[PDB]
């Protein structure tokens with residue numbers, strides 16, 4: 001669909017994003033491309049403060065603006081967190097803060113590195129003739145040496161793309177409901193379950209390409225933001241553009257449109273009830289590109305797939321619907337095994353509730369979200 005910016009091959013991911021900006025923005029591009037050296041050297045904060053206020057008017061198209069958001073995003077995280085020890089800047093310089101805020105307001109995103117920046121736009125194809133696989137792909141920007149950002153962002157991207165194979169089946173589902181096509185609806189649901197099952201298998205790759213200790217103690221702090229964060233409790237002031245400190249949540253796959261959309265499709269009311277988990281998942285829609293925010297909107301306006309399946313007294317159709325719900329439970333149960341390996345165990349090894357980069361009480365949050373998904377199982381009900 002061209003209206004919602006959903007690619008046939010890669011879904012919500014930005015298809016074939018640009019690898020370089022125009023020569024007017026070469027000051028920006030140099031800093032972002034050598035973050036591993038400049039942060040380790042300890043001269044990044046000096047280089048950002050001593051830099052001119054470049055204008056956003058020269059960026060012609062969407063892909064250039066998204067690359068600029070990624071460049072400015074990675075820079076802003078590197079500036080604020082620094083080496084990642086404790087010395088954090090609570091104020092972003094006017095020369096970098098103003099254009100980045102204006103670029104963010106143009107794309108209707110917040111001025112912080114989001115999922116759409118560091119995963120959906122932060123990749124390339126080595127050889128265009130070869131298919132989309134880990135060995136044939138590479139990220140555009142990293143933070144540190146040995147941070148496993150290549151493995152992390154690409155395995156994240158590959159799961160997106162796998163799960164996004166079920167997006168093209170969604171028009172078939174609602175058309176089948178409108179026309180009362182039982183066999184088509186059942187086949188479409190089983191196909192969606194199959195894509196979500198394959199997304200879980202693609203998740204297994206994370207164990208090969210990402211080291212837990214590297215992830216937890218190096219990379220994870222550069223994905224953290226400044227909403228519900230003791231290190232920047234009042235917020236982060238943007239010099240020139242805003243008056244008071246402004247709070248924005250750090251990045252997470254809570255900001256992914258694909259996993260939020262299957263909860264909506266299947267009638268799993270994650271964003272209902274007024275609890276803290278519902279609040280986060282609804283709030284993270286502000287951190288998605290406006291077209292994907294519009295897609296989740298369009299999806300919610302359709303009649304309930306759940307209500308349709310429950311009314312028919314049809315064991316095959318219930319089972320097909322349940323395959324999709326089971327597949328989301330499996331995915332989230334496995335995601336919690338990843339959380340145990342990559343957050344909990346590393347955290348216990350270093351010398352009250354643990355916070356995610358997105359800013360949630362992660363164990364309560366994730367187990368609530370899974371529990372809500374488990375509640376939607378029919379079990380031939």
Ligand code: HEM
Pocket residue numbers: 155156159160203210215251252253254255256259332335338339342343355356357358359360361362365366369370
């Ligand atoms: C090292 C890898 C990963 C870790 C440590 C991790 C950890 C977490 C944490 C702590 C949250 C809670 C939100 C926050 O406050 O930040 C979260 C949310 C989420 N993560 Fe991950 N995550 C990882 C990779 C992935 C991958 C590959 C996916 C792919 C499907 C995924 C899907 C989600 C989703 C969908 C949410 C939102 C809550 C939900 O719908 O279940 N994550 N993750």
Ligand SMILES: N[C@@H](Cc1c[nH]c2ccccc12)C(=O)O
Pocket residue numbers: 114115118119156220223251252253343355356357358
């Ligand atoms: N929220 C995760 C980090 C994470 C996983 N996937 C992401 C995608 C984008 C940004 C951050 C992430 C954590 O607390 O460890």
Ligand SMILES: [C-]#N
Pocket residue numbers: 251252253254
């Ligand atoms: C996943 N954050």
